[PDB]
Amino acid sequence: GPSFPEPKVVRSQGGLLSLKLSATPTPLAIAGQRATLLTYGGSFPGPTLRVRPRDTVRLTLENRLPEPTNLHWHGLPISPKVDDPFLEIPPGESWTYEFTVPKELAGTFWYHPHLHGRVAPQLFAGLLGALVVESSLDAIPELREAEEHLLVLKDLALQGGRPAPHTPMDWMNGKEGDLVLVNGALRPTLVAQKATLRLRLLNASNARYYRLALQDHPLYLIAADGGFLEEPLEVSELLLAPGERAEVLVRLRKEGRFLLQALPYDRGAMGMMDMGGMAHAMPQGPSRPETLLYLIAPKNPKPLPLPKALSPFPTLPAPVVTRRLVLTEDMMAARFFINGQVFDHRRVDLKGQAQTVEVWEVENQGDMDHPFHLHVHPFQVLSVGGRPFPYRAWKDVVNLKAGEVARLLVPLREKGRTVFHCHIVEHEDRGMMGVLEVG
Amino acid sequence: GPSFPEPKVVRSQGGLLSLKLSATPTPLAIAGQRATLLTYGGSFPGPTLRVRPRDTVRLTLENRLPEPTNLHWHGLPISPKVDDPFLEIPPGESWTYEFTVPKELAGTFWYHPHLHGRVAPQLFAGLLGALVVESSLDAIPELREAEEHLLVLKDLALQGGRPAPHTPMDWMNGKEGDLVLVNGALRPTLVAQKATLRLRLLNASNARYYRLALQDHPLYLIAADGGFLEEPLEVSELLLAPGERAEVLVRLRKEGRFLLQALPYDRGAMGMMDMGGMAHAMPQGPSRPETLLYLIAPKNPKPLPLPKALSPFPTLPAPVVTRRLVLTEDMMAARFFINGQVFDHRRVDLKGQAQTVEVWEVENQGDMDHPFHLHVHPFQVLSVGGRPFPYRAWKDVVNLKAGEVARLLVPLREKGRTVFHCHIVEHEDRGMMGVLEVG
Ligand SMILES: [Cu+2]
Ligand SMILES: [Cu+2]
Ligand SMILES: [Cu+2]
Ligand SMILES: [Cu+2]
Ligand SMILES: [Cu+2]
Ligand SMILES: [Cu+2]
Ligand code: NA
Ligand code: NA
Numbered sequence: 001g002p003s004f005p006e007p008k009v010v011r012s013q014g015g016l017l018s019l020k021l022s023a024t025p026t027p028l029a030i031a032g033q034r035a036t037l038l039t040y041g042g043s044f045p046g047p048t049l050r051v052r053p054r055d056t057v058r059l060t061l062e063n064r065l066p067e068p069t070n071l072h073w074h075g076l077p078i079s080p081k082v083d084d085p086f087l088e089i090p091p092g093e094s095w096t097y098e099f100t101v102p103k104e105l106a107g108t109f110w111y112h113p114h115l116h117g118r119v120a121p122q123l124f125a126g127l128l129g130a131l132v133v134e135s136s137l138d139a140i141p142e143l144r145e146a147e148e149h150l151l152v153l154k155d156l157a158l159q160g161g162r163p164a165p166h167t168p169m170d171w172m173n174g175k176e177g178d179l180v181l182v183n184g185a186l187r188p189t190l191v192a193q194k195a196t197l198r199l200r201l202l203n204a205s206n207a208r209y210y211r212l213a214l215q216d217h218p219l220y221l222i223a224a225d226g227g228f229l230e231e232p233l234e235v236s237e238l239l240l241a242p243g244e245r246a247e248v249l250v251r252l253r254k255e256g257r258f259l260l261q262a263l264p265y266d267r268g269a270m271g272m273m274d275m276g277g278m279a280h281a282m283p284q285g286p287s288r289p290e291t292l293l294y295l296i297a298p299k300n301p302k303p304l305p306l307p308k309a310l311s312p313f314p315t316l317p318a319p320v321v322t323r324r325l326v327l328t329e330d331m332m333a334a335r336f337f338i339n340g341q342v343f344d345h346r347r348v349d350l351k352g353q354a355q356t357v358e359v360w361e362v363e364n365q366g367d368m369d370h371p372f373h374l375h376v377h378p379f380q381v382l383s384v385g386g387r388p389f390p391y392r393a394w395k396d397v398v399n400l401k402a403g404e405v406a407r408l409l410v411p412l413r414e415k416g417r418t419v420f421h422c423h424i425v426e427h428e429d430r431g432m433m434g435v436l437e438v439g
Numbered sequence: 440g441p442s443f444p445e446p447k448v449v450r451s452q453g454g455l456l457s458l459k460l461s462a463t464p465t466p467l468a469i470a471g472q473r474a475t476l477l478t479y480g481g482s483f484p485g486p487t488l489r490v491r492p493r494d495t496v497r498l499t500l501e502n503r504l505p506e507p508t509n510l511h512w513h514g515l516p517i518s519p520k521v522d523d524p525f526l527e528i529p530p531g532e533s534w535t536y537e538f539t540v541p542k543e544l545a546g547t548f549w550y551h552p553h554l555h556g557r558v559a560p561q562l563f564a565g566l567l568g569a570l571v572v573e574s575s576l577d578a579i580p581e582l583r584e585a586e587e588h589l590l591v592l593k594d595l596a597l598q599g600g601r602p603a604p605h606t607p608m609d610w611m612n613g614k615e616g617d618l619v620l621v622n623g624a625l626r627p628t629l630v631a632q633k634a635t636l637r638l639r640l641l642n643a644s645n646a647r648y649y650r651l652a653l654q655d656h657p658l659y660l661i662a663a664d665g666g667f668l669e670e671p672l673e674v675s676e677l678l679l680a681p682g683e684r685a686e687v688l689v690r691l692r693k694e695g696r697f698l699l700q701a702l703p704y705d706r707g708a709m710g711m712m713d714m715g716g717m718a719h720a721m722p723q724g725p726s727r728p729e730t731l732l733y734l735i736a737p738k739n740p741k742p743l744p745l746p747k748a749l750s751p752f753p754t755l756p757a758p759v760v761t762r763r764l765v766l767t768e769d770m771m772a773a774r775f776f777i778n779g780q781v782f783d784h785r786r787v788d789l790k791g792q793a794q795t796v797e798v799w800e801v802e803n804q805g806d807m808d809h810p811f812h813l814h815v816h817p818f819q820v821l822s823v824g825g826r827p828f829p830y831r832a833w834k835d836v837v838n839l840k841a842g843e844v845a846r847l848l849v850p851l852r853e854k855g856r857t858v859f860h861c862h863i864v865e866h867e868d869r870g871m872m873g874v875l876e877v878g
């Protein structure tokens with residue numbers, strides 16, 4: 001096979017992507033060992049779906065799991081009557097998701113389960129894949145001539161040839177695994193053929209963070225979760241929290257081997273210690289550094305010039321409401337709250353008007369990082385921690401460190417009942433989710 | 440003094456730069472030794488004159504040399520009745536140059552002798568200085584906040600505490616010296632205080648080339664000889680031929696010491712060998728690498744973003760004539776020709792019309808590099824060697840390797856009699872110069 005493993009791509013044909021996937025326990029080889037994972041399409045990750053604006057997607061999900069499941073079309077601004085977070089597909093049953101890809105859309109999205117209380121074990125076991133909306137911007141020469149790859153960042157732990165079960169501590173912290181994989185492979189080699197790489201990045205982990213750095217190189221951010229930036233942004237490192245996506249250009253500067261690493265990052269995970277008192281929670285501290293892949297540069301690399309511009313960000317109408325959503329924790333209970341409450345699918349927490357813009361102030365009053373996700377309605381991050389964001393782009397997950405306030409500009413798009421929640425999916429399963437109704 | 444030596448600056452006051460300079464033999468300390476050089480203003484280099492568009496310059500040059508001399512205001516699009524290449528100031532006499540700085544002008548220029556047949560020994564002995572036209576573009580934050588320095592690249596050879604005399608070989612090749620200096624200093628240290636440096640670069644050597652590279656860093660070209668580029672251009676190295684200028688931004692990437700070097704470059708200089716036949720010319724080959732300065736980066740450097748734009752390049756009228764100027768050599772005679780002829784100050788070689796545009800095709804049919812200079816009328820290099828130039832900017836010297844054709848777009852500005860010549864000044868003194876009359 002190619003030195004660099006990537007999921008198989010399924011492309012729309014004639015404007016239609018019609019596909020049946022099964023969600024099924026699947027024996028496979030993973031990281032040099034045999035294991036049974038839960039997969040879409042018989043692979044880990046699931047197949048990458050590649051579409052264009054105004055394509056029709058018709059995806060029939062067959063549930064071959066022993067428990068109910070469903071799909072969240074993470075990041076897609078479509079109707080919550082399709083991206084339906086309350087729908088349950090029973091074992092053995094099927095459901096067809098059908099939607100049209102919005103016209104003004106580009107980037108890397110993904111699909112995974114969203115059946116409340118069962119997301120974390122289903123996502124941990126292997127149920128996820130990517131969806132790429134390809135754009136007319138892809139034809140500009142500075143992107144067309146780049147070498148493109150998708151990197152699905154997802155970790156795993158195996159016990160007895162199956163995904164390791166969740167412990168109580170895992171429900172508190174979010175589960176991380178010791179196998180830190182790219183596209184389901186352990187530290188693959190990317191032997192670059194071109195001097196400019198375009199890398200679509202997806203954090204499809206339950207809880208692990210990836211503080212990304214490429215040895216000896218900056219990265220050029222060109223898209224956030226839900227769309228292009230207005231122009232490339234040079235960064236020395238890039239933090240992707242669970243559920244976030246980004247696209248970067250890499251301009252290889254000389255021949256050689258360069259490690260792409262997940263550098264040490266402390267997200268606030270907790271352990272327990274007994275030091276002659278009795279059992280007390282103690283910080284785990286920063287993650288151990290991980291090598292994600294080996295990047296081999298071609299001979300005498302001469303990277304393309306960067307694009308001068310990407311996509312202008314829409315001018316949004318003035319907002320009509322300001323919301324405040326406060327995140328708190330009860331760590332020893334593994335319970336997580338928004339404005340003092342746990343999720344209740346019968347309770348509507350926020351009511352807004354379609355086609356207006358709202359300002360959401362989300363405040364992390366906990367000690368862990370929490371990556372806040374809103375379904376259906378992509379947002380513009382104005383500031384986090386009191387610092388203005390350095391670019392304009394559509395996002396749908398925003399990471400909050402302890403104490404920080406994010407200010408979001410939220411245009412409300414499709415009508416219906418949807419949700420917002422922490423994308424440490426264990427925290428969603430344990431209550432950190434609420435209901436938005438748009439009318 | 441400051442760790443980084445730079446010439447003293449003289450600034451216009453209230454719109455006027457009124458200065459008397461003397462050209463005089465001057466005992467000084469140079470590169471750790473005492474020598475007598477020929478200087479302007481008692482220093483080597485001469486003082487940097489710093490002015491703004493529409494300033495008046497009133498410079499009285501007092502000749503305290505034992506031979507006649509004059510000034511060429513290299514690169515300034517002013518009248519050749521002021522920048523007069525035929526004027527002789529006798530020993531002991533003075534002359535006042537008075538002109539207004541053009542409104543649409545910016546960059547690094549310089550002044551030096553232009554008395555035909557005596558340029559090479561006068562320039563080699565120390566007679567040169569810089570002139571900076573500061574621009575409203577200097578106030579954009581990406582330049583204003585950079586740390587600015589001038590680097591005058593000029594080599595020297597000393598014999599008996601004076602500049603070394605010219606040999607016959609030196610008249611053939613152009614003289615290079617073993618002391619390869621920056622601002623008259625030997626391998627100075629630049630201890631950067633800011634992470635972005637703006638470096639004005641001047642090759643004021645008789646003949647030496649500087650194939651510039653900064654260890655571990657690209658350079659961002661922002662101006663050529665006579666003005667800004669339209670936007671910054673990333674380059675891995677930058678060749679400055681005699682008489683050229685450039686301005687670059689340096690974006691320091693990490694703490695440490697980085698050498699700015701003149702890398703090996705073969706300009707076609709010739710030696711003589713006797714191997715049992717008899718005496719035959721043999722290539723000298725590439726220059727030995729030289730370290731120009733040590734660049735110390737500050738702690739945790741965070742460079743400014745590059746400017747997105749600099750100055751739009753003027754749209755020029757369609758040209759009305761195409762000229763062909765062919766450069767040839769008689770190396771053993773140390774004679775150099777344009778279209779078969781040596782300079783004659785009584786003979787007009789080209790006659791053009793003010794405010795028209797001409798295409799000049801300059802063809803190097805010799806084996807040495809020749810840097811072709813036109814007084815008074817800055818030009819746009821369209822292509823050299825059949826390769827399009829990668830930027831639009833005003834230039835006034837264009838380097839031609841053996842065999843290469845440069846195509847230049849030449850707007851004719853001020854009326855009068857002026858010259859064009861090789862800026863290996865030994866080759867000008869030995870005939871490689873001709874006369875342009877604009878009416
Ligand atoms: Cu998601
Ligand atoms: Cu959380
Ligand atoms: Cu969700
Ligand atoms: Cu000159
Ligand atoms: Cu020459
Ligand atoms: Cu001249
Ligand atoms: Na299957
Ligand atoms: Na003097």
